[PDB]
Amino acid sequence: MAGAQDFVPHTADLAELAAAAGECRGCGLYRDATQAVFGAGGRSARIMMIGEQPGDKEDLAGLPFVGPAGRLLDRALEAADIDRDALYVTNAVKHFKFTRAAGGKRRIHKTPSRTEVVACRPWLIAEMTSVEPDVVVLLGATAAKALLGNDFRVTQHRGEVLHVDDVPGDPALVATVHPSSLLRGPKEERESAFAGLVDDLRVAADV
Ligand SMILES: O=c1cc[nH]c(=O)[nH]1
Numbered sequence: 001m002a003g004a005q006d007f008v009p010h011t012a013d014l015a016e017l018a019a020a021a022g023e024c025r026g027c028g029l030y031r032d033a034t035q036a037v038f039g040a041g042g043r044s045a046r047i048m049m050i051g052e053q054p055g056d057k058e059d060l061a062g063l064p065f066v067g068p069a070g071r072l073l074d075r076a077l078e079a080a081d082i083d084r085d086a087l088y089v090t091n092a093v094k095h096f097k098f099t100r101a102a103g104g105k106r107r108i109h110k111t112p113s114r115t116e117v118v119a120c121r122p123w124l125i126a127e128m129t130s131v132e133p134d135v136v137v138l139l140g141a142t143a144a145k146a147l148l149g150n151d152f153r154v155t156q157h158r159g160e161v162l163h164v165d166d167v168p169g170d171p172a173l174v175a176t177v178h179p180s181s182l183l184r185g186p187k188e189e190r191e192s193a194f195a196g197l198v199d200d201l202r203v204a205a206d207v
């Protein structure tokens with residue numbers, strides 16, 4: 001598949017890239033979503049962070065990581081002494097994939113297929129080309145697999161500094177737990193997992 005490639009313009013300007021993502025039809029996810037959600041921040045960023053996809057909040061705000069997972073993430077960044085205004089924050093897939101359940105308090109996100117990730121990956125390539133980050137934080141399974149391969153296991157490479165040639169700039173790559181995984185479950189387990197997120201964020205910051 002060609003995917004998003006036909007829709008990515010020959011430019012490194014983020015505002016231009018964001019606009020053209022708004023017209024992307026490189027998989028079927030544009031149809032039900034409200035709008036594309038491009039990355040936030042600037043091309044001076046040293047650290048890029050990539051999540052899975054916009055959720056419910058993000059689909060309507062037009063910005064990444066503005067819901068509960070994003071508030072958790074801010075708490076982690078803060079403890080790692082990282083200013084979020086200095087990052088470029090984005091997602092592997094740029095349109096919200098979702099459903100609704102009866103009695104639901106919100107739209108429930110559905111995991112992008114590997115095919116959708118590969119379809120949308122040209123946007124990530126363009127973002128990386130535009131920003132030239134020194135390090136990329138891969139937030140959770142989908143984002144990590146997008147760069148590291150569909151077989152990659154986030155849980156097994158926590159806190160490791162990774163590199164593949166496959167990527168623009170040969171930044172270091174640090175794969176970590178998705179902040180939404182820390183929202184729920186037993187208290188000791190959340191707190192432990194949170195401490196590891198802070199650690200992995202510091203690994204990325206010290207590259
Ligand atoms: O931006 C976001 C928000 C929630 N979950 C993600 O993966 N990315």
Ligand code: SF4
Nearest residue numbers: 004024026027095120
């Ligand atoms: S999800 Fe990515 S590839 Fe699919 S339509 Fe939206 S922007 Fe294009």
